[PDB]
Design a protein around this ligand. Structure first.
Ligand SMILES: OC[C@H]1O[C@@H](O[C@H]2[C@H](O)[C@@H](O)[C@H](O)O[C@@H]2CO)[C@H](O)[C@@H](O)[C@@H]1O
Ligand SMILES: [Ca+2]
Length: 193
């Protein structure tokens, strides 16, 4: 299936680049998956004094049965990278809510390794409760700054990412955990470490 809307003015696509820093004012190869429930503009905005890819999302009040249906699902296609000697994949993730009071966001990471059926999903989904935010200190530009980490030795389905396993795509999903989130999201510094 494909989720479609009228042409949207994304920032230039650029070329797949890791670490993804967005400092060339392009998306450095990131784009929505054709199945992403969010297809609005991906632009390069400043977040916490660095350029970051960004989009807007307000999840539906009526929650879909399928937990990824309404989710931003962003992908770095055809990067053909490998983890090397890195234990983690990590990135800066920022929120600028106009509404956030209940439920949570559940952030998942996956890859598409041609040797592993084109899908390998990190086990360690990260949940951000929206009631936690009001007590969290914001950045000077009014964002909530998370550095999210995924242990690449914890993968579903007994699949193993070796140092040399080719990862053709990287996918990040920000799913709605029964939340009332509305606002802006940003990613920066997407890298293995
Ligand atoms: O439908 C949500 C569900 O998706 C699962 O991943 C799928 C993905 O949606 C599809 O694009 C891809 O081709 O295959 C994978 C694996 O079947 C995901 O594993 C679930 O955690 C998620 O709830
Ligand atoms: Ca940056």
């Amino acid at each position: 299936r494909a989720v479609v809307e009228a042409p949207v003015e994304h920032a230039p696509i650029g070329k797949a680049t890791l670490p993804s820093t967005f400092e060339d004012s392009t998306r450095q190869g990131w784009a929505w998956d054709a199945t992403s429930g969010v297809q609005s503009a991906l632009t390069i905005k400043d977040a916490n004094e660095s350029k970051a890819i960004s989009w807007e999302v307000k999840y539906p009040e009526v929650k879909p049965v399928d937990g990824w249906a309404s989710a931003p699902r962003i992908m770095l296609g055809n990067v053909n990278t490998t983890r090397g000697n890195n234990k983690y994949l990590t990135f800066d993730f920022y929120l600028k809510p106009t509404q956030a009071s209940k439920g949570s966001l559940t952030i998942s990471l996956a890859f598409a390794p041609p040797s592993l059926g084109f899908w390998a999903q990190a086990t360690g989904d990260v949940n951000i409760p929206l009631s936690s935010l009001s007590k969290m200190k914001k950045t000077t530009d009014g964002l909530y700054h998370f550095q999210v980490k995924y242990d690449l030795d914890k993968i579903n389905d007994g699949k193993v990412l070796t140092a040399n396993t080719v990862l053709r795509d990287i996918t990040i999903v920000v799913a709605d955990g029964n939340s009332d989130f509305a606002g802006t999201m940003y990613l920066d510094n997407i890298r293995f470490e």
